[PDB]
């Protein structure tokens, strides 16, 4: 029993964190094989013009108390790739994956190439992440673990004026309409991840919280007309199919649970909580719920 | 900016998790140097659990009855002893991944990271607090026994908890790494219940200071309170008494924000009376009590927004 916001064990990623310094700027790098990946802003910026003026010895890479020798450098989108002389002996089995809004991941927050904390979060529909970062955190990474393979999905680049965060996949493509420069940028209006709230309502039923269940059902179209009113993301037939396993386990059809969510949106919690929360939680995917309510290991 | 429930990086602890099997029971062990620590109830049957005589059950065991597995490698047990509710299995190999460590016993209100494990394999990490009633609100299934709680301030791992059991309300009970239980619990399937729980007042105050540091002040008021008047009000909402030690502990956050501890106590009294009125504090519609004053200073900036 119990339901916590749970992150993946961070050990495989900790063995990849390094400190990258260029001039007066220090940030974090990800050392995989003989390449160190980091935000290109470590160097109106014309990044190819700024990069051509740098030599390998301008980039100081530190792995623990050991200095790594940079033997090459190249840029791929908004990520800088520093070729080093030594392959990381702690390199795990890995993949670079781009995630979709609504998907969750673990973040290993780092300062000076040293991991300080791990938390779980979701890629918001507006492509920002509600993270917890201070100056020095740039280059910190987001990941998931599938079996023994670490899938890297995020690298931190910046904080927006509202306190939310923006970054790229490991190929340097930003999530959202952001650019890596000091300019006027704002996160768009955010929405609630509907399929994740439903998965979290199923997790509450599994843990014995059923006060919000009712005898009613709804059509998908009527639910989407109501959900569009409360800034909730539209629920697709794919989301319904994805919630199939949890529907079979609890005996509550996905549209039967949508009628519960509709009543919660129009009437509120009424002083009650669900899994210790007075708000509807949207940072647990259907897979996160099944994994935490089954004990899958890495 | 931002405020998340943050756990310590679990790598130093992952390299210590092993699987311990005794007969039909399998659970987790902590391998440090040449010793594997695990709940002593690994020697029990489900029948034995009502009134187990652990000393009588242990004397009947030999070293070869305990199967210890570290990854895909079988460890050789060369000795065994019991210390309170923990079983200590001496093994023939020292763990090469043993970090710098300490065994620390924590007090209620203290927070720590839990690395939940099944079959000696880590599955997840979360942050939690030792409740005033000595239970923890964890996320544990069958097979999680032996999973550990820890803090990693600097590069040293301080082990503070080992999971032993789930109570009827779904909350969890366990011991420090010397086998002493937190709370009035026993490793027996006898009728045991968690006492009525209360809110960790010093932690809610620390979290209100974290909100002020992150730029939120909607909940502040022009009032102050005496410590005694605050405690008379707080007791009525099932909040733990706030001691002078708690006031002293909140001194640094009071100096950083410019809000006296008893002035912050007046905002808290008002929040309890009024509720939030559709507003949130650090993305939460409830008053959060699982961030200590030390967690807030560690996570938050030194410059108030
Ligand atoms: O009555 C029981 N019901 C399930 C098995 C059994 N347990 C009695 C018991 C009594 C004393 C001691 Cl020290 C350990 C234990 C064990 C325990 O509680 N294990 C668990 C531990 N954590 C989270 C669980 C979730 C779900 C099932 C077990 C869980 C076993
Ligand atoms: Cl303590």
UniProtKB/Swiss-Prot annotation, chain B:
Cross-link for Glycyl lysine isopeptide (Lys-Gly) (interchain with G-Cter in ubiquitin), residue positions: 5, 90
Record field: catalytic activity: TSAVLQ-|-SGFRK-NH2 and SGVTFQ-|-GKFKK the two peptides corresponding to the two self-cleavage sites of the SARS 3C-like proteinase are the two most reactive peptide substrates. The enzyme exhibits a strong preference for substrates containing Gln at P1 position and Leu at P2 position
Active site per UniProt: 41 (for 3cl-pro activity), 145 (nucleophile)
Activity regulation, short description: Inhibited by pyridone-containing alpha-ketoamides compounds 13a and 13b. In turn, alpha-ketoamide 13b (tert-butyl (1-((S)-1-(((S)-4-(benzylamino)-3,4-dioxo-1-((S)-2-oxopyrrolidin-3-yl)butan-2-yl)amino)-3-cyclopropyl-1-oxopropan-2-yl)-2-oxo-1,2-dihydropyridin-3-yl)carbamate) inhibits SARS-CoV-2 replication in human lung cells. Inhibited ex vivo by michael acceptor inhibitor N3. Inhibited ex vivo by compound 11a and 11b.
Localization, UniProt: Host cytoplasm; Host Golgi apparatus; Host nucleus
Taxonomy, superkingdom: Viruses
Effect of residue 145 to A: Complete loss of 3C-like proteinase nsp5 cleavage
Cytoplasmic side: 1-305
Effect on the protein of changing residue 90 to R: In strain: Beta/B.1.351
Domain Peptidase C30 stretches: 1-305
Complex formation: 3CL-PRO exists as monomer and homodimer. Only the homodimer shows catalytic activity. Interacts with host FBXO22; this interaction promotes the proteasomal degradation of nsp5.
Role, per record: Cleaves the C-terminus of replicase polyprotein at 11 sites. Recognizes substrates containing the core sequence [ILMVF]-Q-|-[SGACN]. Cleaves and inactivates human TRMT1, preventing tRNA guanine(26)-dimethylation of tRNAs. May cleave human NLRP1 in lung epithelial cells, thereby activating the NLRP1 inflammasome pathway. May cleave human GSDMD, triggering alternative GSDME-mediated epithelial cell death upon activation of the NLRP1 inflammasome, which may enhance the release interleukins 1B, 6, 16 and 18. Also able to bind an ADP-ribose-1''-phosphate (ADRP).
Name assigned to this protein: 3C-like proteinase nsp5
